[PDB]
Enzyme design. Structure first.
Site, PDB file in Angstrom:
ATOM      1  N   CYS A 105       0.822  -1.209   0.000  1.00 25.30           N
ATOM      2  CA  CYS A 105       0.000   0.000   0.000  1.00 25.30           C
ATOM      3  C   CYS A 105       0.859   1.264   0.000  1.00 25.30           C
ATOM      4  CB  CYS A 105      -1.009  -0.024   1.143  1.00 25.30           C
ATOM      5  SG  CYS A 105      -2.253  -1.318   0.859  1.00 25.30           S
ATOM      6  N   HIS A 106       1.880   1.292   0.858  1.00 24.48           N
ATOM      7  CA  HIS A 106       2.807   2.435   0.929  1.00 24.48           C
ATOM      8  C   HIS A 106       4.263   2.017   1.164  1.00 24.48           C
ATOM      9  CE1 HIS A 106      -1.222   3.424   2.526  1.00 24.48           C
ATOM     10  NE2 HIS A 106      -1.163   4.402   1.638  1.00 24.48           N
ATOM     11  N   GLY A 107       4.562   0.736   0.951  1.00 26.26           N
ATOM     12  CA  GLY A 107       5.956   0.274   0.902  1.00 26.26           C
ATOM     13  C   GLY A 107       6.647   0.031   2.229  1.00 26.26           C
TER      14      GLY A 107
END
Ligand code: FES
Length: 141
Positions: A105-107
């Site tokens: 989703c955001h690493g």
């Protein structure tokens, strides 16, 4: 009466079993010898989050590998599969750069003990109330 009882008798090394509990996934990974050694090789000073985030032990416990598993041998890693950033499901099977999980989703990258190593998530994946009640069954909750 919330507690559930998971048969782990058929979980082989390198396999993660995912079970739904309180509406969310719990990851039960039987760790490989590589996963275990890697986790035990990390120094606390290298960690983003040094807290064990473990419901089973003191809330001030350090996030050593030993404080992240159910068993002394370190084979049984039981955690909420809920990214501590915004709650996406981290992808396993030794994903990401730290031999553990990657949240796309955001690493966020988590290591082989589910500890946060890179990315926006602030915390190690939390560990639920969990214990073996015999050779083959983990009680959750
Ligand atoms: S929800 Fe996992 S990195 Fe944002």
């Amino acid at each position: 009466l919330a507690s559930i009882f998971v048969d782990v008798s058929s979980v082989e090394p390198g396999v993660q079993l995912t079970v739904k509990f309180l509406g969310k996934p719990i990851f039960i990974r039987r760790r490989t010898e590589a996963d275990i050694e890697l986790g035990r090789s990390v120094q606390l000073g290298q960690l983003v989050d040094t807290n064990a985030r473990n419901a089973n032990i003191d809330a001030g416990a350090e996030a050593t590998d030993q404080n992240r598993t159910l068993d002394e041998a370190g084979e049984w890693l039981v955690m909420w599969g809920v990214c501590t950033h915004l709650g996406c499901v981290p992808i396993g099977g030794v994903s990401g750069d730290f031999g553990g999980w990657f949240c796309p989703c955001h690493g966020t990258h988590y290591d082989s003990a589910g500890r946060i190593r890179k990315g926006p998530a602030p915390e190690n994946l939390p560990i639920p109330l969990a214990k073996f009640i015999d050779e083959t069954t983990i009680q959750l909750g």
